Structures are given as C-alpha cells and as structure tokens.
RNA sequence: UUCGGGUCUUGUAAUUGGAAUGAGUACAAUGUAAAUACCUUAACGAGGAACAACUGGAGGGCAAGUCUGGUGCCAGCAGCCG
RNA sequence: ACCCACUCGGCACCUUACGAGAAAUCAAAGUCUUUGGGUUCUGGGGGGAGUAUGGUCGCAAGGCUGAAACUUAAAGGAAUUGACGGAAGGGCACCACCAGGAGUGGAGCCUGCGGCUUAAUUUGACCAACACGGGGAAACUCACCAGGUCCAGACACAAUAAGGAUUGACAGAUUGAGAGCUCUUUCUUGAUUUUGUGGGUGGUGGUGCAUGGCCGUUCUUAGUUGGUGGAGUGAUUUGUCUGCUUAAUUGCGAUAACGAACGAGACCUUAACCUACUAAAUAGGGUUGCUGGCACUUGCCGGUUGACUCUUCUUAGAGGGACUAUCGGUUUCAAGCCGAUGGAAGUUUGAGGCAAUAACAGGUCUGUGAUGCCCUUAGACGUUCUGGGCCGCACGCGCGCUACACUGACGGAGCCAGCGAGUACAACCUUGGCCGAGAGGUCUGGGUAAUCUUGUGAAACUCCGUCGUGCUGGGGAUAGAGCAUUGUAAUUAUUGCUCUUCAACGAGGAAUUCCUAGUAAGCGCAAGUCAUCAGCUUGCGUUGAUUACGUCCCUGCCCUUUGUACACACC
RNA sequence: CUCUAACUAUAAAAAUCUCUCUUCUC
RNA sequence: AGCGCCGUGGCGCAGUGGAAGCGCGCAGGGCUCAUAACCCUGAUGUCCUCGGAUCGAAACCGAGCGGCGCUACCA
C-alpha cells in the first residue's frame, strides 16, 4: 500500500494469464537462497546450482522470495549464470508439477 | 484489462452453399416437335400465370415463385 | 486589365551535343655506371566519363534528421551527460 | 573618587560600502588581472586513508613521518523556493476534539466489494473504491459463456459471367427452432452481386502511463499573479507586512514601494415580511339568492358552476424592506467586536449556484459518429438469435433496513402537509359505480394539468380498549400451500395478497461515523431508475430536541520565523 | 522640558518504506 | 523394587476444597496509506483412569495407569 501505486503503469492483468513454456534454453528452476544486489540463487531441474540475476522487467516490477518456481533464460557462453526473465504465480506451476516438465521430487506446496 | 486468447472451434466447418449452376438448363424444361409446335416437360404454376415450371421432386410438384403456398402431391 | 510574354538573370531534370585532359599502356629519346622512375613525347587511352573516395558522425558538448522499417531498458550505443 | 577634553596600548562593539568575496559575510577576509612590503607552514576531485609498510619517540596507550594498487563523476561550499519537523509564534475546521445527541461495529436481511467456485460467475474504481459507473441486469440491456445466423466487406481493379456472376425456397434429413443455417432432390431470380488485390468500415477490443471534454481531489481553505520601481551576479525577493480586526490577501493602517488583475465579497436562485399597488370562475372570502337539518328570536352547521362584490390568506409581476438602524459599553479610539431596544429579519439573515494560479501520470476509450496508436475485420473481438451468468457460497469488510419492546405491540376512532408527476401516434395519473376477504378485476367518467387523481383524508401522532416483563400478542428471518398482477417468457421463489413454522436477537468489545436550530433524530410522501420490482438516491414536508457558542489535546488546514545531509520533497 | 520597579510555574511511548523523473523556440 | 515429582488446549505454567484456567502460540477483527508493535474476541480438554465423603470434585483421600529423579541393579 501506499502513494505509490497511483504512480505505476496500472497494469492489471488479474485475469488468469497463459502460462510460457521452455523454449530451447529456456528452462524452470526453483529459488533456493535469495542473495543481495538483486541476485538468486536458482535450482535449475538438472542436479545443477545456477547463479541466476534479478533482470530487466523484473526487478522493481514483481517480487519474488525463497522458494518459487522460476523461468531463467541461460547463457552458452557461460553456463553457470544465467537470468530470471518470467515468475509463475504458484497456480500454473501445480500444473506444471502435473505436466511434469520438472522432476516431481521437487514438492513446494503451501 | 482484457485477456483473450485464441479461439479454438469444436466444429469441422459449415460450408457456403454454392446454388447449382446448370448449363443448358433451359431446354430441358422445354420440347420442340419438329420444326414447329414446342412443348414443356415440366408444368405450368397456376397462381403465379403462364410460364412458370413446377418442381418436382417426389410425389408432389412444387413453385418457385409463389413456392411457399404451392406443393401439390402427384 | 487575372494574365502575362521571362521582357533580365540563377539553378533543377536517367534529357542531349561538341570539346579538353590526364591515371594508365608505349614507338622513341633524355635520364642512369647499367637500368627503373621523373621531364619531354609518337601511337592508343572517358560517357553511367563502372577510370564509380573513403573515413566518422546526424540529442547536447559539436556542423548535420524529432524521416522510414526493425528491436523493445534485449541487442547494443555512448570519451562525459545520457 | 567622579565630570569634561586629548593621547598611547588592549579585549571588544555599532553603522556603511565607497572596497573584497561564490556568497554567509569581513573595517579586515580591504589596499589582487590597475595582479610584487618581508617571511614560515599547508592543499591540488572524492574514497581507499591519515590505512599498510619503513623509520622514530613511548613501559603501555599511542604520537610524528606517511603512499600505492584499485574504485569513482562527482563528493563538497554558500544561498533561493518549496516540502517536512514527535521546532516556535499567531489563527481556524463537528469530513477534529471538549459537552453531548443519534448511531455503526453485536443479530437477521438487502445491497456493493474481496476471496473461493464456475463454461461464464463480464468488467472499472481499493480520505479522494465499495446503494459508485444512475450498475433496482429474468429477455434486450451485454460488455462473459455453450452454441446458431447474416454482411450491415463502401469504392477501384482484375476475374469469372447473360447457353447463369448470382439470389431465394415448399417438403423432408439436420437443427431448439415454423433457420433453405447445412444436405436430398429440384424450381425461382436477374448484373444489385460472387472470388482475389488494394482499401474502407464495425468493434461496451487494448492502452485514461498517448489524448480531448467532464468531473473528483489537493482546497472550503484564502490563496495567486504579472507592469514600472528598489535589493540581490544570480536562482529569487519587496509589492503579498510589525500589529489589531475579519469567515476572507476582510479592512484599519505602517511602509521601496505605487498603481492594478483573478479569487473572497459583490452577484443570481431560494426562504422568509408585505392588510401598500395590479389583478383572478384553473384561488379563495363576504353579502344575498334557491335549499337541507337542528333550534325556535332574529341563530347555528351545511348544499348551489344562481347573482353582486372584495383580494386578508393562495397565486405572480413591478416595487418596498436591513444598511448592524438607534442607544449603551470596548477598541492606536480607526477597522471593528459585545449587549439591549425597535424589528420580520441583526450568524454574510438562513440554504445554496458559480467559484482563482498551479497540479495529480487521481477516474472515465465502458457516454459520445470525441479520439492517436496497436489489435481484429469472415466459422469476426462486427451484428443478430436461443439458453445460461452478472444473484452461486467453507469465509472477511463497506453503505443501510427491521428489531431487541411498556416512551411499547395489537384493535378500533380521530384525520394533518409540501415538493412532484401524469396518455399521440399512444395506450399515462386515476376518481366514481359494481364485484372479490386482499392483491386485484370489470364498467363508466375526468385530466395534455392551480381545472381531473388531489385537500395526494401519508405515517409518526392523538383518544379509548386488549395485552402485562413471559424471547411474550416483540422480533418476522427461513420455509410449505394457495390466489393474482406485469411480462413472449417469472423455475434460480419478479412483485402483491391469504393461512401456518415462527429462527437469531437481552442496547452489542476493541474501534469508529454524522451533527450546534426548524439542526440532529423519528416519520413518511413525491420524483429518478420503471412493462413489473426497491430496503437506493435526489427532493419535500410532519413531530421535533440534549448539549455547546470553546480549544489546539487527537486528526488536519492558513500565514510567519527557524533548521534541514529532504526536492521521485519524512511513504 | 522632567524618572530605576514587578515576579513565577509541564518534559510518558512513536520502529520501518519500493518501482519511476520525462524538449522549451518568436 | 522402593521412595520422591508430575498428569495442557499445541508448549511453559496455576489455583486447587465453589467448576474451565493464565501467558506463549493459532484464527478473525481493530489502529496505520502499509507492515511490525499495540488493542479486542474465540477454538481447542476426558487438569491421567477406577472409587469413598460431600449441594460440589479436578482438587481432599484411597484402588490403579503412564512418564521423570534418589536409593541404585539390591545373590
Ligand atoms: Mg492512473
Ligand atoms: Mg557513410
Ligand atoms: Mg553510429
Ligand atoms: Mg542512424
Ligand atoms: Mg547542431
Ligand atoms: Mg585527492
Ligand atoms: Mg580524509
Ligand atoms: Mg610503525
Ligand atoms: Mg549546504
Ligand atoms: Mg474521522
Ligand atoms: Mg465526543
Ligand atoms: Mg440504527
Ligand atoms: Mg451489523
Ligand atoms: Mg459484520
Ligand atoms: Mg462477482
Ligand atoms: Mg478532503
Ligand atoms: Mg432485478
Ligand atoms: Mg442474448
Ligand atoms: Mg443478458
Ligand atoms: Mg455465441
Ligand atoms: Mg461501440
Ligand atoms: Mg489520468
Ligand atoms: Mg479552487
Ligand atoms: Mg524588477
Ligand atoms: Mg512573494
Ligand atoms: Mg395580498
Ligand atoms: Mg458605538
Ligand atoms: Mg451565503
Ligand atoms: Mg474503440
Ligand atoms: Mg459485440
Ligand atoms: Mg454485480
Ligand atoms: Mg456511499
Ligand atoms: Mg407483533
Ligand atoms: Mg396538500
Ligand atoms: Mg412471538
Ligand atoms: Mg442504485
Ligand atoms: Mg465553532
Ligand atoms: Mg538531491
Ligand atoms: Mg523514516
Ligand atoms: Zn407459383
């Protein structure tokens, strides 16, 4: 709450939005330990730890704590970091955990 | 804000019906005897005047111009 | 008197003509110890004169676009502010 | 020991710029671009950092000396305008409080949000969203959903094409359909069309963070602005203020300020007062007729569209009236305040309508054939048809309504308003007479309106009785059955009426809302929504108070002073 | 053109805040 | 085995002779533009099980159940 909200863009998109995929080094991850500067800490759904930042359109815009299912684009570059470009607001990402795109073993329910 | 997607149909399609277009359609509604007296395969419509053609289909013949109030059973 | 001859000139047009010339080739001769090369010069050598000039920039500093398309705080640009 | 005058030396001080400074300011910080009296020490953007190292002093603490690597576009000084202060001065506001009143928050229900649910439960607002979009949606509305239609694709060109570009259809399958939507067959129709290109329209499609217009808010407070003139190098400032007064930047005034402009006021509507004017069968009154009754005295209460006459009330025009009028206090005796009297009226007489500069990324593309851009433009996000939803329900919140009863409920009887509104190319307001217990039905008659509904014979209220402190004759939610009305259509009860079950509710915690006189509160009526439907809103009138007539304590507002490392401004 | 008088006096607690800053010529 | 202690509503506690307690939790609401702080209201039992007296038992007591601590493994 606050002054600031009149500020914004207003952009109410509260109606149930499609979901985005993975596409071809696209892929989900889950938060595992937020860091400072605007950085995470992803999980990515490959046995693997990517160093994952805080990125345009997203980091005053949405946010995000310990614990969320994420899309982060990577870098072939250079594998170990890579950015967080899109959140799913805990309501697709059952779907997903349906779907299976992630290893279920991976449980983050409230 | 609006959120619309795509809409996805559960139905083939429904086609446009194409009138059947017959080439030399008119002679066949006609009968020339020889050189001279004609006459008509099909029958004369009596509300609409001379003329007009009957359909027919099966056991009935049916208008085209007054067609609504014309179907008489053969 | 609306004009308007353009009366007097200056540009713009894949229209159109006649000239001049090298950059190149090359008889020679000069040049040089001998040769190149330069100066001179026969004979060729310009029409899209294709014989075609690039290197940077067009927000400000700083001369020049708030034209068109593309990407959408991406890609990138930016000596500094951006 | 003082007094007067002078002088030397010292800590100092007031005024001023004619000098110096980026200014705050300095009589030195002057005699500095018109640059040089002698001389010592220190600084070269910020940070790292007065850190490490190496010396040196010290018992120790630590002192003196003292970088770089690297990082950074600023850090910093003075002042100007705002904003803010749990800083100060002076004033205000029941969207603040004190003294109170009525409340809400507890209960049930109606409505509006959130959430959940759903095919959809369409959406925008989150003091200044939430009975708001006139948003009381059964169809339409409509914007959502499952489906079904059509082009309402202008125009230009090409293309087919008059031995058919095309259009439409009885009956059947199909469909929810009596849809020639699609098919079976065939018949009808004539250059309007059909299929491709360009383009154009339509869109409650998106973007109010692209816009207009409008409205809301900052801000109901009194605040703004520029022209000459003064001070500043300047951003700016004075005019716009020390005081007192006012609701007011309202005035009296003092003055580097003088004259002005917008706002406030003035101004209009409305409410009063008009035995003064003009008048009135669309308003009333008197006298007298013609009658009814009771009294018997000539009088009372009535009826008549019979006559004459009048305008006090009812109307509406021109005007009058109040300007703090007179008087008494108090006031640099000026602006003005307080009181009494006369008044109708003495809070600006009450209540309003407009209502300044600057601004919000406040709302509205969903009011507009206002609209830029983007999207879509044929099985369409266009339009139309059918049905469903916008009303679901483990839950929370906001406007309200009915109540918890004795100052009451229920019976009778009394009988009192003011705003309105009302039918024509449609069917409105309804009197009256008959029916029905009621809703209602029917037959007639008025009214396109001071004429008729209508004196809207309204409720609260009043008088007499039943009830008797018992969740009871309170409360009437939730249901069962039936009778009617509007409607093409009423189930997911439209609404009204009749009989019954009668639930929670014992004056409601924290907290919080509105309001100082015909005010709050109680009570209803009319109008807007309206074919039918309000528990809503806008207005109107009835009965009508308690308690202030003050304050800056909470929440804020206005001006001034001060401080700021704030200016996307204390979020 | 003449003068030196009046006076007081309260301190409870109150932490924090995220986007985003956008040309001025006759 | 005996003796000392005890018997949550989720946890730590309290009165136990007059009938459901506090605090900390949890849910909802309030203040605030917003959060924490703060304020208000609940929704959770067999104050372990079987009996005695009693208007009353959970207490007071006893006919037991289970868990901790001292004696200490008590041939
Ligand atoms: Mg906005
Ligand atoms: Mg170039
Ligand atoms: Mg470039
Ligand atoms: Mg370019
Ligand atoms: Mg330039
Ligand atoms: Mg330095
Ligand atoms: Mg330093
Ligand atoms: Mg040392
Ligand atoms: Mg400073
Ligand atoms: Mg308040
Ligand atoms: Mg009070
Ligand atoms: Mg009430
Ligand atoms: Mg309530
Ligand atoms: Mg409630
Ligand atoms: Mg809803
Ligand atoms: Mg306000
Ligand atoms: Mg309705
Ligand atoms: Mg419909
Ligand atoms: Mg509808
Ligand atoms: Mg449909
Ligand atoms: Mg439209
Ligand atoms: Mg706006
Ligand atoms: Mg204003
Ligand atoms: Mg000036
Ligand atoms: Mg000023
Ligand atoms: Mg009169
Ligand atoms: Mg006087
Ligand atoms: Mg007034
Ligand atoms: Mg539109
Ligand atoms: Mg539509
Ligand atoms: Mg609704
Ligand atoms: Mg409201
Ligand atoms: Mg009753
Ligand atoms: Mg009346
Ligand atoms: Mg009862
Ligand atoms: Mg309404
Ligand atoms: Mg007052
Ligand atoms: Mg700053
Ligand atoms: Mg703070
Ligand atoms: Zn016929």
Known sequence: ?110 | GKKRKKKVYTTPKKIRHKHKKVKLAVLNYYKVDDEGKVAKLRKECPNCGPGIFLANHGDRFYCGKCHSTFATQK
């Open chain 1, 1 to 110: 709450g606050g002054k600031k909200g009149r500020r914004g863009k207003n952009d109410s998109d509260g109606p149930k939005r499609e979901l985005i995929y993975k596409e071809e080094g696209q892929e989900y991850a889950q938060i595992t330990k937020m860091l400072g500067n605007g950085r995470v800490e992803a999980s990515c759904f490959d046995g693997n730890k990517r160093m994952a930042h805080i990125r345009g359109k997203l980091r005053k815009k949405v946010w995000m704590g310990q614990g969320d299912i994420i899309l982060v684009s990577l870098r072939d570059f250079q594998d170990d970091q890579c950015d967080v470009v899109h959140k799913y607001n805990l309501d697709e990402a059952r779907t997903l955990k349906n779907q299976g795109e992630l290893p279920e073993n991976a449980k983050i329910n409230e």
